[PDB]
Amino acid sequence: AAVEVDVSASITLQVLVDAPGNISCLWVFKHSSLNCQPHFGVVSMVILKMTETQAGEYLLFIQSTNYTILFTVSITLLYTLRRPYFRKMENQDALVCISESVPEPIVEWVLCDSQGEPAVVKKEEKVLHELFGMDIRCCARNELGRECTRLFTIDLNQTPQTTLPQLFLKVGEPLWIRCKAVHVNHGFGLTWELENKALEEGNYFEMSTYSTNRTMIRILFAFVSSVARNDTGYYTCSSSKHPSQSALVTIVEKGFINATNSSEDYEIDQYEEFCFSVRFKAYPQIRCTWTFSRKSFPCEQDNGYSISKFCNHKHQPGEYIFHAENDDAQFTKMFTLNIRRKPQVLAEASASQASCFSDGYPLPSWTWKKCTEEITEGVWNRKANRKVFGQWVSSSTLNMSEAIKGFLVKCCAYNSLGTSCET
Amino acid sequence: TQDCSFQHSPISSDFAVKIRELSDYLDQDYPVTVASNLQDEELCGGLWRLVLAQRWMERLKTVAGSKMQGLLERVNTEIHFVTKCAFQPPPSCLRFVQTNISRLLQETSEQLVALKPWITRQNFSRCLELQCQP
Ligand SMILES: *[C@@H]1O[C@H](CO)[C@@H](O)[C@H](O)[C@H]1NC(C)=O
Ligand SMILES: *[C@@H]1O[C@H](CO)[C@@H](O)[C@H](O)[C@H]1NC(C)=O
């Protein structure tokens, strides 16, 4: 009944109780609603890094019968971790990075000098003056882990993405957009426009650096310190001697996690590689973890979204869980995969009381139906899947006769893959 | 003879680092003649001082050894833009004093700081002829 949460801890609280049938539940969080879809039944109640806000009264009831449950999540150590915010130097042409966390974290800079995006030297100095082209990255290392940040730069001196580039920002967190332009001659200028209208006065920032044989490389930054639903629009950046590259910018007052959602049912055969992937587009950094009967495996993030797959199946069927709890929103997605090994009947139970139950196992296509053929049979199994955890292995029992045959013993499995029988 | 108003800024933001790097790696303090009587104007005179400095930078490329050629040319490329305007030959009235390459480099950087915010705003066609004022 009483839960004690120490710091940003990652533990599971989505226990399963035997409830199969026409049962549907709905999560009732601390003075707020929570949409869920269980498998009957167990619903999304596990947590990865329980934030100082994420604690309190959490209820859950069934709606068809109506019985409600109650859990009290309680929490001192002053642990804080927040993504770094970019900033422009005070009366100087340089960019300094700052991070709001306890204690002051070590911030380093990265710039992939090679043609593509472990490599390239990190200059941990915070105030960065040398910043032209490449993938600009800024990460922090505090006592509560590691919170990364990425400075977006759209290089005009490259082929277009052609996939509608976008960048969602948090209401209040500053908005930054730079243009890594490369022109042989010095006569080249970049301009910022929202919808064919000039950029705000408090946004213009020029930093033209000269590189290689008589060649210049200019960068036009777009700075907006306080962002709001006023600057939610597609921003373009055209140049004097370079094509017009553009990127849409949307705002969210809290956050957003969106995912396509799959059929959640697979008839995978032996080997054949097979993978369970999720198409999720989300802001901010999606903290993901896959769960499978106590397993903990973290996941990695053409360009319209960032998908991630879980190829650690290794012929282990069952219900695979995929949680993704961001720093504001929560999401969970379970999928069911069964093995195509259809099956040898051998797990017979020698019951002496009236008739011995002979059961055949494995999964999903399994049928138990027993020299010559004998008429009149007992049970025929028939039961719904996902009905609480308990004992290992599941079989389809189909033997309960009263005829006096003597030594014979039933159990003869028949399926699409083949046949087998017990003693 | 062009309007001399530059389309986009010819003065880069990293000129100070480039000048300090040449100042710290110079093995010898080469003899250089800065001007002592150019007509009194910081903006108008800035271009004139850079034209004289650019000639010295080109001259230094022809006398510095193999190892120093790259560093000298790096400075030359930052101030080569003055060669795009039809600046006329220095008048016979022009006077100058002998100094060292370190001082010339520092003076050059100072002129670029002063000229940078005005190079694309005003028409400097009337500056093609260097003027004196004793
Ligand atoms: C030198 O400049 C010319 C003209 O822009 C160019 O073709 C050449 O590739 C440049 N050299 C290098 C090493 O980039
Ligand atoms: C949006 O910004 C403009 C410019 O500052 C301002 O005039 C306008 O009132 C703002 N609108 C809202 C809804 O804040």
XYZ file of C-alpha atoms and ligand atoms in Angstrom:
585
model
C 0.000 0.000 0.000
C 2.890 2.367 0.853
C 5.631 3.017 -1.757
C 9.017 4.663 -0.922
C 10.788 6.320 -3.905
C 14.470 7.182 -3.396
C 15.770 9.727 -6.011
C 15.120 9.214 -9.836
C 14.764 5.424 -9.430
C 13.770 3.003 -12.216
C 11.577 0.163 -10.847
C 8.496 -1.775 -12.048
C 5.072 -1.711 -10.352
C 2.911 -3.317 -13.113
C 2.120 -6.599 -11.325
C -0.266 -9.157 -12.877
C -3.386 -10.547 -11.109
C -5.494 -13.423 -12.606
C -8.301 -11.588 -14.452
C -9.109 -13.072 -17.919
C -12.245 -12.201 -19.900
C -14.302 -9.064 -20.651
C -12.236 -6.816 -18.340
C -10.968 -3.286 -19.193
C -9.224 -0.840 -16.835
C -8.305 2.914 -16.801
C -5.495 4.589 -14.797
C -6.401 7.424 -12.393
C -3.195 9.349 -11.557
C -2.683 12.210 -9.015
C -5.711 14.469 -9.865
C -5.314 13.569 -13.581
C -6.394 10.859 -16.050
C -4.144 8.259 -17.706
C -5.074 6.306 -20.844
C -3.965 2.656 -20.891
C -4.547 -0.618 -22.802
C -3.930 -3.839 -20.824
C -3.520 -7.480 -21.901
C -6.163 -9.772 -20.348
C -4.739 -8.296 -16.864
C -1.669 -6.042 -16.602
C -1.588 -2.297 -17.486
C 1.280 0.295 -17.772
C 2.412 0.922 -14.150
C 6.259 0.568 -14.421
C 8.504 3.656 -14.048
C 11.949 4.674 -15.351
C 13.432 7.581 -13.294
C 10.489 8.674 -11.074
C 10.700 12.507 -11.191
C 10.021 14.714 -8.125
C 6.623 15.480 -9.720
C 5.826 11.804 -10.524
C 4.630 10.645 -7.042
C 1.342 10.438 -5.095
C -2.128 8.867 -5.209
C -2.456 6.357 -8.096
C -5.765 4.477 -8.596
C -6.857 1.754 -11.074
C -10.315 0.159 -11.509
C -12.179 -2.231 -13.877
C -15.149 -1.022 -15.973
C -17.559 -3.483 -17.644
C -18.344 -5.013 -12.245
C -16.391 -2.101 -10.740
C -13.687 -2.614 -8.077
C -11.090 0.164 -7.484
C -7.457 -0.175 -6.206
C -5.232 2.426 -4.402
C -1.436 2.937 -4.152
C 0.410 5.717 -2.265
C 3.740 6.684 -3.869
C 5.890 8.687 -1.427
C 9.457 10.084 -1.762
C 15.692 15.198 0.540
C 18.837 14.238 -1.419
C 18.713 17.442 -3.612
C 19.376 15.505 -6.853
C 18.655 17.459 -10.061
C 19.391 16.909 -13.761
C 18.255 19.083 -16.687
C 19.213 19.266 -20.398
C 21.692 22.079 -21.159
C 20.441 25.430 -22.553
C 22.481 27.204 -25.255
C 23.392 30.900 -24.953
C 25.099 33.769 -26.829
C 28.195 35.450 -25.355
C 27.862 38.754 -23.553
C 29.297 41.433 -25.929
C 31.313 38.747 -27.809
C 30.981 36.637 -30.984
C 30.971 33.233 -29.245
C 28.488 30.619 -27.915
C 28.597 29.500 -24.268
C 26.739 26.432 -22.923
C 25.109 26.288 -19.472
C 23.293 23.481 -17.581
C 20.780 23.816 -14.713
C 21.713 20.847 -12.507
C 23.042 20.100 -8.988
C 26.047 20.143 -8.862
C 27.653 22.193 -11.720
C 28.329 19.693 -14.530
C 31.305 19.334 -16.893
C 30.254 20.441 -20.392
C 32.262 19.413 -23.490
C 31.994 20.365 -27.197
C 31.983 18.026 -30.228
C 32.377 18.680 -33.976
C 32.651 15.786 -36.484
C 35.233 17.255 -38.910
C 34.897 14.254 -41.291
C 32.387 13.979 -44.232
C 29.829 12.150 -42.046
C 28.395 12.544 -38.539
C 33.876 8.374 -30.616
C 35.767 10.493 -33.203
C 36.902 14.239 -33.228
C 38.483 16.034 -30.208
C 36.293 17.331 -27.310
C 37.109 20.831 -25.991
C 35.536 21.080 -22.494
C 35.686 24.877 -22.062
C 31.974 26.001 -22.084
C 32.696 29.274 -23.951
C 33.084 28.200 -27.596
C 34.352 30.634 -30.245
C 35.478 28.089 -32.883
C 32.129 26.814 -34.206
C 31.693 26.474 -37.979
C 30.007 23.495 -39.666
C 30.089 19.848 -38.465
C 27.705 18.284 -35.866
C 27.652 20.641 -32.854
C 27.046 18.716 -29.600
C 26.961 19.730 -25.909
C 26.687 17.194 -23.080
C 26.798 17.569 -19.275
C 28.141 15.192 -16.578
C 26.530 15.782 -13.136
C 26.098 13.540 -10.006
C 22.650 12.369 -11.266
C 23.924 10.763 -14.505
C 24.339 12.469 -17.885
C 21.974 14.877 -19.729
C 22.866 15.546 -23.400
C 21.943 18.477 -25.704
C 22.351 18.965 -29.489
C 22.736 22.356 -31.206
C 20.854 22.190 -34.516
C 22.720 23.472 -37.570
C 21.304 23.227 -41.135
C 24.218 23.168 -43.618
C 23.253 24.939 -46.838
C 26.454 23.645 -48.546
C 24.930 20.135 -48.857
C 22.165 18.244 -50.737
C 18.596 18.729 -49.373
C 17.095 16.289 -46.831
C 13.789 16.240 -48.840
C 11.870 14.752 -45.875
C 10.296 17.965 -44.393
C 12.832 18.839 -41.664
C 11.329 19.734 -38.262
C 12.345 20.685 -34.687
C 9.927 20.713 -31.726
C 10.881 23.000 -28.809
C 9.769 23.297 -25.157
C 7.780 26.440 -24.154
C 10.386 28.630 -22.449
C 13.514 26.786 -23.632
C 15.384 28.959 -26.176
C 15.299 28.304 -29.950
C 18.527 28.233 -32.000
C 19.099 27.615 -35.743
C 22.382 28.146 -37.639
C 23.434 27.946 -41.338
C 26.855 26.449 -42.235
C 27.324 28.143 -45.626
C 30.373 27.595 -47.854
C 31.080 30.040 -50.715
C 34.272 30.494 -52.769
C 33.909 34.281 -52.892
C 33.307 36.638 -49.914
C 30.124 38.048 -51.531
C 27.525 35.700 -50.009
C 24.867 36.452 -47.384
C 22.286 34.393 -45.489
C 18.907 35.758 -44.337
C 16.255 34.475 -41.905
C 12.497 34.622 -42.716
C 9.406 33.000 -41.131
C 6.974 33.158 -44.104
C 8.621 35.674 -46.509
C 8.922 38.211 -43.616
C 12.246 39.343 -42.057
C 13.608 37.946 -38.745
C 13.144 39.786 -35.425
C 15.672 42.486 -34.409
C 16.688 40.309 -31.439
C 17.774 37.338 -33.588
C 20.442 38.574 -36.069
C 23.937 37.214 -35.306
C 26.786 37.060 -37.849
C 30.003 35.030 -37.530
C 31.905 34.841 -40.837
C 35.156 32.831 -40.614
C 37.717 32.580 -43.455
C 39.111 29.130 -44.343
C 41.109 27.272 -47.115
C 42.590 28.991 -50.280
C 40.887 32.451 -50.588
C 37.514 31.048 -49.460
C 34.976 32.240 -46.842
C 32.466 30.359 -44.643
C 29.673 32.419 -43.007
C 27.077 31.399 -40.389
C 23.773 33.202 -39.716
C 22.319 32.259 -36.308
C 18.652 32.599 -35.231
C 18.311 33.357 -31.505
C 14.978 33.394 -29.612
C 15.426 33.326 -25.796
C 11.785 33.110 -24.598
C 9.748 30.845 -26.891
C 5.932 30.733 -27.001
C 2.868 29.791 -29.236
C 3.630 33.077 -31.124
C 6.724 31.681 -32.930
C 5.195 28.275 -33.861
C 5.770 28.279 -37.636
C 7.932 27.018 -40.520
C 11.264 28.931 -40.615
C 13.219 29.306 -43.885
C 16.864 30.322 -44.483
C 17.759 31.510 -48.032
C 21.198 32.681 -49.238
C 22.582 35.051 -51.941
C 24.406 32.345 -53.938
C 22.977 29.172 -52.349
C 19.606 27.362 -52.655
C 16.767 27.952 -50.139
C 16.830 25.302 -47.363
C 14.021 25.318 -44.757
C 12.848 23.623 -41.518
C 9.488 23.754 -39.654
C 9.418 24.633 -35.940
C 6.536 23.593 -33.625
C 5.925 24.425 -29.931
C 4.520 22.334 -27.062
C 3.528 23.689 -23.643
C 4.325 20.351 -21.908
C 5.700 17.733 -24.342
C 4.777 15.074 -26.920
C 5.219 11.309 -27.549
C 3.625 9.879 -30.717
C 3.823 6.298 -32.047
C 2.238 4.525 -35.093
C 1.195 1.337 -33.120
C 1.546 -2.170 -34.690
C -0.769 -5.282 -34.857
C 0.956 -6.756 -31.713
C 0.632 -10.405 -32.878
C 3.244 -12.389 -34.842
C 3.429 -15.906 -36.334
C 7.265 -16.011 -36.564
C 8.845 -19.245 -37.840
C 12.089 -20.947 -36.591
C 15.094 -18.583 -37.005
C 14.259 -16.171 -39.990
C 15.953 -13.289 -38.019
C 12.672 -11.350 -37.130
C 12.620 -8.043 -35.206
C 10.116 -6.007 -33.153
C 10.480 -2.296 -33.975
C 8.576 0.829 -32.835
C 8.002 4.010 -34.888
C 8.179 6.719 -32.226
C 8.615 10.468 -32.752
C 8.973 12.281 -29.402
C 10.181 15.397 -27.522
C 12.180 15.571 -25.297
C 14.830 12.745 -25.124
C 12.868 9.460 -24.978
C 14.221 7.287 -22.155
C 13.486 3.726 -23.377
C 13.795 0.230 -21.850
C 12.451 -3.157 -22.992
C 11.005 -5.563 -20.394
C 10.607 -9.347 -20.723
C 9.970 -11.424 -17.539
C 12.713 -9.407 -15.589
C 14.950 -8.456 -18.565
C 16.256 -4.872 -18.801
C 17.592 -3.794 -22.197
C 17.949 -0.118 -23.197
C 17.299 1.007 -26.801
C 18.830 3.479 -29.330
C 16.905 6.390 -30.934
C 13.893 7.998 -43.763
C 14.163 11.038 -41.466
C 10.517 11.816 -40.565
C 10.886 9.873 -37.278
C 13.389 7.935 -35.073
C 12.558 4.212 -34.778
C 14.174 1.511 -32.588
C 14.094 -2.289 -32.819
C 14.532 -5.113 -30.264
C 16.329 -8.018 -31.962
C 17.173 -9.912 -28.757
C 14.402 -12.481 -29.365
C 16.708 -15.562 -29.688
C 13.660 -17.905 -29.885
C 12.145 -16.787 -26.556
C 8.371 -16.430 -27.115
C 5.931 -14.483 -24.942
C 4.799 -10.935 -24.193
C 7.472 -8.292 -24.859
C 7.001 -4.907 -23.162
C 8.322 -1.585 -24.555
C 8.213 1.422 -22.220
C 9.365 4.964 -23.087
C 9.021 7.495 -20.245
C 10.220 10.980 -21.278
C 10.858 13.902 -18.836
C 7.100 14.763 -18.977
C 5.052 12.153 -20.904
C 4.712 8.352 -20.541
C 4.127 5.545 -23.085
C 4.020 1.732 -23.055
C 3.578 -0.847 -25.855
C 3.347 -4.645 -25.499
C 3.682 -7.151 -28.369
C 3.062 -10.925 -28.579
C 5.311 -13.330 -30.496
C 4.954 -17.127 -30.548
C 7.359 -19.864 -31.682
C 6.488 -21.931 -34.781
C 7.688 -25.168 -33.077
C 4.569 -27.354 -33.255
C 4.880 -29.930 -31.027
C 5.736 -33.288 -29.442
C 3.199 -34.596 -26.912
C 5.091 -36.065 -23.938
C 3.992 -34.229 -20.742
C 1.299 -36.688 -19.610
C 0.105 -36.590 -15.988
C -0.434 -40.022 -14.409
C -3.653 -39.310 -12.498
C -5.230 -42.400 -10.925
C -8.617 -40.755 -10.050
C -11.097 -41.934 -12.803
C -8.986 -40.779 -15.827
C -5.384 -39.634 -16.431
C -5.023 -36.176 -18.003
C -2.655 -36.414 -20.994
C -1.455 -32.958 -22.127
C 0.489 -31.858 -25.198
C 2.640 -28.715 -25.378
C 4.207 -26.182 -27.013
C 2.937 -23.034 -28.928
C 0.849 -21.488 -30.857
C -0.615 -24.103 -33.233
C -1.130 -27.090 -30.926
C -3.880 -29.728 -31.004
C -4.106 -32.845 -28.819
C -6.240 -35.652 -30.301
C -5.643 -39.372 -29.666
C -3.057 -48.822 -32.654
C -6.621 -48.192 -33.928
C -8.701 -45.043 -33.190
C -10.791 -44.939 -30.002
C -14.127 -43.095 -29.686
C -15.410 -40.846 -26.773
C -12.973 -38.270 -25.341
C -12.934 -36.126 -22.172
C -11.802 -32.480 -22.065
C -10.673 -30.448 -25.126
C -8.599 -27.653 -23.415
C -9.976 -24.386 -25.130
C -8.823 -21.376 -23.064
C -7.958 -17.678 -23.555
C -4.300 -16.548 -23.714
C -2.547 -14.221 -21.167
C -4.182 -15.395 -17.914
C -1.748 -14.390 -15.071
C 1.694 -15.883 -14.293
C 2.281 -18.970 -12.147
C 3.704 -22.284 -13.364
C 6.232 -22.928 -16.165
C 5.043 -24.237 -19.613
C 1.438 -24.395 -20.901
C -0.199 -27.482 -22.434
C -3.556 -28.431 -24.012
C -4.964 -31.412 -22.074
C -7.411 -33.618 -23.992
C -7.732 -37.061 -22.325
C -10.336 -38.347 -19.813
C -11.866 -41.726 -20.766
C -13.477 -44.558 -18.735
C -12.977 -47.559 -21.105
C -10.856 -50.515 -19.906
C -7.963 -50.715 -22.386
C -5.140 -51.446 -19.929
C -1.617 -50.336 -20.848
C -1.988 -47.802 -23.695
C -1.796 -44.126 -22.426
C -3.298 -41.299 -24.565
C -1.683 -38.054 -26.060
C -1.092 -37.796 -29.824
C -0.536 -34.246 -31.052
C -1.541 -33.199 -34.567
C -0.643 -29.815 -36.095
C 0.315 -28.066 -39.389
C 4.006 -28.769 -38.664
C 3.497 -32.492 -38.006
C 2.621 -35.213 -35.478
C 4.071 -36.946 -32.351
C 2.755 -39.101 -29.438
C 3.411 -40.079 -25.765
C 3.872 -43.534 -24.083
C 37.369 52.114 -60.610
C 34.449 50.571 -58.687
C 31.946 52.097 -56.189
C 34.001 50.429 -53.390
C 31.130 49.613 -51.043
C 31.551 45.746 -50.777
C 28.490 43.487 -51.223
C 29.110 41.415 -48.068
C 31.524 41.963 -45.152
C 35.124 41.333 -46.243
C 36.296 41.550 -42.571
C 36.116 38.150 -40.866
C 35.500 37.537 -37.141
C 38.584 35.275 -36.642
C 41.205 37.838 -37.806
C 42.364 38.500 -34.188
C 43.254 34.818 -33.570
C 45.054 34.602 -36.944
C 47.076 37.774 -36.212
C 48.020 36.642 -32.677
C 49.118 33.233 -34.044
C 51.494 34.874 -36.563
C 52.737 37.238 -33.789
C 53.532 34.285 -31.488
C 55.242 32.077 -34.136
C 57.415 34.748 -35.858
C 61.035 33.551 -35.448
C 62.442 36.982 -36.398
C 61.096 40.525 -36.109
C 61.247 41.429 -39.844
C 61.784 45.112 -40.684
C 58.723 46.801 -42.168
C 56.458 51.728 -43.072
C 53.723 52.613 -40.843
C 52.499 55.843 -42.551
C 53.173 58.962 -40.470
C 51.084 61.618 -42.309
C 47.923 59.996 -43.794
C 44.904 62.424 -43.840
C 43.242 62.405 -40.397
C 40.256 60.035 -40.517
C 39.831 56.683 -38.744
C 37.346 55.262 -41.286
C 38.719 56.864 -44.522
C 42.282 56.303 -43.252
C 41.596 52.717 -42.161
C 41.417 51.470 -45.752
C 44.576 53.420 -46.651
C 46.511 51.834 -43.759
C 45.259 48.353 -44.807
C 46.349 48.949 -48.440
C 49.900 49.710 -47.206
C 49.829 46.715 -44.816
C 48.634 44.364 -47.604
C 51.647 45.325 -49.764
C 53.926 44.453 -46.824
C 52.202 41.113 -46.284
C 52.732 40.199 -49.958
C 56.371 41.369 -49.710
C 56.912 39.188 -46.587
C 55.683 36.087 -48.477
C 58.577 36.603 -50.976
C 61.299 36.817 -48.261
C 60.154 34.476 -45.433
C 61.436 30.872 -45.545
C 59.465 27.725 -46.404
C 58.142 27.161 -42.854
C 56.855 30.758 -42.494
C 55.171 31.046 -45.917
C 51.925 29.383 -44.814
C 51.551 31.597 -41.720
C 52.335 34.799 -43.665
C 49.884 33.889 -46.470
C 47.151 33.202 -43.872
C 47.388 36.866 -42.794
C 47.578 38.016 -46.443
C 44.292 36.199 -47.247
C 42.443 38.141 -44.503
C 43.408 41.546 -45.969
C 43.622 40.665 -49.738
C 40.158 42.276 -50.288
C 41.796 45.717 -50.676
C 43.236 44.479 -54.041
C 39.623 44.283 -55.411
C 39.320 48.123 -55.365
C 41.254 50.365 -57.792
C 43.419 52.088 -55.150
C 45.782 54.544 -56.834
C 49.608 54.652 -56.306
C 50.805 56.374 -53.102
C 51.498 60.099 -53.542
C 55.016 61.570 -53.234
C 53.815 63.541 -50.139
C 53.416 60.241 -48.154
C 55.875 59.762 -45.281
C 56.443 56.711 -43.066
C 58.669 55.330 -40.287
C 60.492 51.983 -40.080
C 59.003 49.555 -37.535
C 58.878 45.760 -36.810
C 56.478 43.109 -38.201
C 54.897 42.577 -34.743
C 53.819 46.270 -34.571
C 52.561 46.205 -38.191
C 50.427 43.125 -37.446
C 48.942 44.729 -34.305
C 48.221 47.971 -36.225
C 46.613 45.963 -39.057
C 44.251 44.177 -36.644
C 43.305 47.533 -35.065
C 42.377 49.005 -38.466
C 40.167 45.996 -39.271
C 38.278 46.415 -35.952
C 37.586 50.062 -36.898
C 36.641 49.365 -40.549
C 34.561 46.170 -40.060
C 31.225 47.881 -39.059
C 31.425 50.457 -41.881
C 32.845 48.522 -44.869
C 29.380 47.654 -46.346
C 27.413 50.771 -45.166
C 29.245 53.666 -46.878
C 30.428 54.349 -50.436
C 34.249 54.545 -50.303
C 34.856 55.246 -54.041
C 36.227 58.686 -53.006
C 38.960 56.873 -50.969
C 40.844 55.392 -53.993
C 43.471 58.154 -53.734
C 45.567 58.083 -50.545
C 45.718 61.611 -49.051
C 48.278 63.276 -46.798
C 47.889 65.782 -43.915
C 51.107 66.641 -42.036
C 42.175 26.331 -54.563
O 41.198 27.180 -55.171
C 40.657 26.647 -56.397
C 39.657 27.657 -56.906
O 38.609 27.867 -55.970
C 40.049 25.265 -56.155
O 39.762 24.665 -57.412
C 41.016 24.369 -55.379
O 40.384 23.132 -55.068
C 41.493 25.046 -54.091
N 42.433 24.195 -53.381
C 42.090 23.449 -52.325
C 43.191 22.641 -51.706
O 40.944 23.427 -51.889
C 3.703 38.050 -31.047
O 4.876 38.861 -31.192
C 4.638 40.182 -31.718
C 5.981 40.870 -31.799
O 6.595 40.969 -30.521
C 3.640 40.917 -30.824
O 3.306 42.163 -31.425
C 2.381 40.078 -30.629
O 1.484 40.742 -29.746
C 2.730 38.701 -30.062
N 1.528 37.897 -29.900
C 1.284 37.157 -28.814
C 0.015 36.357 -28.836
O 2.053 37.130 -27.859
